[PDB]
Design a protein around this nucleic acid. Structure first.
Ligand SMILES: [Mg+2]
Ligand SMILES: [Mg+2]
Ligand SMILES: [Mg+2]
Ligand SMILES: [Mg+2]
Ligand SMILES: [Mg+2]
Ligand SMILES: [Mg+2]
Ligand SMILES: [Mg+2]
Ligand SMILES: [Mg+2]
Ligand SMILES: [Mg+2]
Ligand SMILES: [Mg+2]
Ligand SMILES: [Mg+2]
Ligand SMILES: [Mg+2]
Ligand SMILES: [Mg+2]
Ligand SMILES: [Mg+2]
Ligand SMILES: [Mg+2]
Ligand SMILES: [Mg+2]
Ligand SMILES: [Mg+2]
Ligand SMILES: [Mg+2]
Ligand SMILES: [Mg+2]
Ligand SMILES: [Mg+2]
Length: 49
RNA sequence: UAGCUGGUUCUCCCCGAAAUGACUUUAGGGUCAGCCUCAGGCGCUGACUGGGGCCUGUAGAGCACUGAUAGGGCUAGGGGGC
């Protein structure tokens, strides 16, 4: 048993999502596509309306 | 700082919206609900349909109520004439 194949067993999918591309999450990048979508939104937790 | 404008880069596969309601110094922004999706759980219930019961005041019609209305009759009131 050696370093060739001691790999992460059948999980731990370190693959984050990349929303810059021409397919999948794209252009608008992730759930956006409108406005007040830029630096941040006010909360909600407590804050808002 | 910018609740505004612009821009956001490889591939294939499955599903697939909304542009409504409530509140908002709210109205091209938001929070909750509605609608989308994924995971786990329940498992014949779901849309649609057959049979039966109850709830209803629209279309149409009607003048019994509330009002409107043409002609005639009968008839207080008022008007003209003896
Ligand atoms: Mg990346
Ligand atoms: Mg990128
Ligand atoms: Mg994807
Ligand atoms: Mg997409
Ligand atoms: Mg815009
Ligand atoms: Mg818009
Ligand atoms: Mg901001
Ligand atoms: Mg799918
Ligand atoms: Mg389809
Ligand atoms: Mg109210
Ligand atoms: Mg605004
Ligand atoms: Mg919401
Ligand atoms: Mg069934
Ligand atoms: Mg009736
Ligand atoms: Mg009618
Ligand atoms: Mg009668
Ligand atoms: Mg009457
Ligand atoms: Mg009365
Ligand atoms: Mg008479
Ligand atoms: Mg008289």
């Amino acid at each position: 048993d050696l370093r060739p194949n001691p790999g992460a067993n059948k999980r731990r999918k370190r693959v984050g999502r990349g929303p810059g591309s021409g397919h999948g999450k794209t252009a608008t990048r992730g759930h956006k596509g409108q406005k007040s979508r830029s630096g941040g939104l006010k909360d909600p937790r407590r804050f808002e309306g």
